[PDB]
Design a protein around this ligand. Structure first.
Ligand SMILES: CC(=O)c1ccc(-c2cccc(NC(=O)CCc3cccc4c3[B-](O)(O)OC4)c2)cc1
Ligand SMILES: [Cl-]
Ligand SMILES: [Cl-]
Ligand SMILES: [Fe+3]
Ligand SMILES: [Fe+3]
Length: 433
C-alpha cells in the first residue's frame, strides 16, 4: 500500500501489526497493540466490568511491557483506563503515557473512588500520576519517532480520538465516540486528514439509535409512571459523564410538571467537570446513611451496572416491590447484574447470597453516547480508509457491522475498503511500501 500522505520503482515493504489484548470481539478492557518499524504503541488500558481480579485485565502477558514506547488513553471510562495504575506500577513498562488534560483531571478522582468500593492500591494510583503526561487537542506530540494528536470524540468530557503517524503511515483510533450533539457535549469531529487505517468501536453494531427527543420522552414518562404509582425509581449511572445529561433532562421535566415538585430526585455521588447544572429539583446525596428512603423518589446512584455499591444496595432494597422500578441508561456488559436482569429472571441473588423475587419494573433506554450504524457509516465514508479494524463490540454485533460495511464498498471503483474483526490476541498485518 502507498501511504495516502505520499510510477517510481517501489523499495521493500514494511509490515504494520495490530493486535487487541482486550476489546477484541468484546466490550470491556480496551487494549490494542500497534507495531510498526520498531515502534510499539498501546491504545487504552482498561478493565472488563463483568470479570473479577486478574481475569478483568487485558491479555498483557502476551507482550513484553518493557518494549512499549507509547501508551495513549482515549477517555476516563474504566474499560479504557481502569488497568492503568496496575500497568504503570506492577509491570516493566517504562514508556510514555498520554491523556487529555480533562481525562487526567477526572481520572485521578475517579479511580480513587473505584479503589474505595485487588489489582492496585491508592498508593499505586498516586505514585503513577506523575508518569502520565497530558496533551491538548489539535497539538502534535512526538515520542520515539511517533507523531500523534487528537480530535474531540464527543461521548464524555475530555474524550479523544488519536491520530498516529509513523513513517508517513497514519492511523486513527476512535476510542468511544458519538456524532450526536448532547445538551452539554459537542459531537465528535470528522478529521480532514485522511488515515490509512481506522480502528473504530462497534458497540451498537448495525442498530440505529432512536431519535433523541423520543428517548428523552420515554425516559421521562417511565420515571413519571414509577413515582406516580408510589414507587422508588432507581437510575444506575457511572459516577460522571452520562449522568449529567440525565439530570438535565429530569430537572427540565420536573420544572414542567408541578404535580411532581414534592417528589425528590437524589444524585448520589462522591467537581472539575464544571471547571472544564445548578438544578432546581435535584439534591445531592452522600451515602445510603444520608438518605431517607421515603417513597416515592428518584435516586441516581453509582455504579452503572449495579455490580456492588450504592446502586446495588438500593436495587436489593427495592426489587421485591412492584411499585418500584429501575431504568438502565447504559450499555449492559455481559457478566453484570444490569445485563442479567434483561432476561427477566424471576429471582435475583443479593451480594450476601440471599434469593429475592424481582418484582420491580425494569426498563432499558440507552443514553450511552456511542456511534450507531448511520453515524459510523457516514464517518467511514468521509474518511475512506483502505483498512478498517473493528473493536469494542460483542461478537455478533461486530460481525453484522463488518458484513454491512463490506457490502457498502463492493461496487466502489474508487476504493475497496477491507474490514477486520480480530479476536483477542489475533493479529491483523498490513504491508506498506
Ligand atoms: C466492583 C465495582 O463496583 C465496579 C466494577 C467495575 C466497574 C467498571 C469497570 C469498567 C467499566 C465501567 N464503566 C464505565 O467505564 C462506564 C462507561 C461504560 C460502561 C459500560 C460499557 C461501556 C462503557 B463505555 O462508554 O466506555 O463503552 C462501553 C465500570 C465499576 C465498579
Ligand atoms: Cl523511518
Ligand atoms: Cl501472530
Ligand atoms: Fe466510554
Ligand atoms: Fe468503552
Amino acid at each position: 500500500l502507498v501511504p495516502r500522505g505520499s510510477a517510481i520503482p517501489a523499495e521493500e515493504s514494511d509490515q504494520l501489526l495490530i493486535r487487541p489484548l482486550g476489546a477484541g470481539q468484546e466490550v470491556g478492557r480496551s487494549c490494542i497493540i500497534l507495531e510498526f518499524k520498531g515502534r510499539k504503541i498501546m491504545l487504552d488500558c482498561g478493565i472488563h466490568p463483568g470479570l473479577e481480579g486478574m481475569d478483568a485485565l487485558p491479555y498483557i502477558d502476551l507482550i513484553d511491557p518493557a518494549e512499549i514506547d507509547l501508551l495513549l488513553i482515549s477517555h476516563f471510562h474504566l474499560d479504557h483506563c481502569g488497568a492503568l495504575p496496575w500497568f504503570l506500577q506492577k509491570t516493566s513498562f517504562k514508556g510514555r503515557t498520554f491523556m487529555t488534560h480533562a481525562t487526567k483531571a477526572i481520572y485521578r478522582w475517579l479511580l480513587s473512588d473505584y479503589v474505595k468500593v485487588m489489582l492496585y492500591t491508592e498508593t499505586d494510583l498516586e505514585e503513577s500520576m506523575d508518569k502520565i503526561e497530558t496533551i491538548n487537542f489539535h497539538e502534535v506530540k512526538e515520542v520515539a519517532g511517533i507523531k500523534f494528536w487528537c480530535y474531540h470524540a464527543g461521548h464524555v468530557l475530555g474524550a479523544a480520538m488519536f491520530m498516529i503517524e509513523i513513517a508517513g503511515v497514519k492511523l486513527l483510533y476512535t476510542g468511544d465516540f458519538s456524532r450526536q450533539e448532547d445538551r452539554h457535549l459537542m459531537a465528535a469531529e470528522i478529521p480532514n486528514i485522511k488515515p490509512d487505517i481506522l480502528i473504530i468501536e462497534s458497540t451498537y453494531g448495525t442498530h440505529i439509535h432512536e431519535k433523541r427527543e423520543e428517548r428523552e420522552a420515554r425516559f421521562c414518562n417511565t420515571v413519571h409512571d414509577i413515582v406516580n404509582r408510589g414507587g422508588r425509581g432507581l437510575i444506575p449511572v457511572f459516577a460522571l459523564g452520562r449522568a449529567q445529561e440525565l439530570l438535565l433532562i429530569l430537572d427540565e421535566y420536573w420544572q414542567n410538571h408541578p404535580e411532581l415538585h414534592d417528589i425528590p430526585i437524589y444524585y448520589a455521588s462522591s467537581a472539575v467537570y464544571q471547571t472544564y447544572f445548578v438544578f432546581k429539583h435535584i439534591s445531592n446525596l452522600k451515602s445510603m446513611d444520608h438518605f431517607d428512603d421515603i417513597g416515592p423518589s428518584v435516586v441516581m446512584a453509582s455504579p452503572g451496572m449495579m455490580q456492588s455499591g450504592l446502586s446495588r444496595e438500593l436495587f436489593e432494597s427495592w426489587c421485591t416491590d412492584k411499585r418500584n422500578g429501575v431504568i438502565i441508561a447504559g450499555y449492559c456488559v455481559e457478566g453484570t447484574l444490569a445485563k442479567h436482569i434483561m432476561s427477566e429472571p424471576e429471582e435475583i441473588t443479593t451480594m450476601s447470597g440471599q434469593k429475592l423475587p424481582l418484582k420491580m419494573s425494569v426498563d432499558y433506554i440507552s443514553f450511552s453516547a456511542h456511534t450507531d450504524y448511520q453515524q459510523t457509516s457516514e464517518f467511514i465514508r468521509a474518511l475512506k480508509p483502505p483498512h478498517v479494524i473493528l473493536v469494542h463490540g460483542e461478537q455478533n454485533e461486530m460481525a453484522r457491522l463488518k458484513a454491512a460495511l463490506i457490502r457498502e464498498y463492493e461496487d466502489n471503483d474508487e476504493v475497496h475498503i477491507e474490514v477486520h474483526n480480530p479476536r483477542n490476541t489475533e493479529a491483523v498485518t498490513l504491508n506498506f511500501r
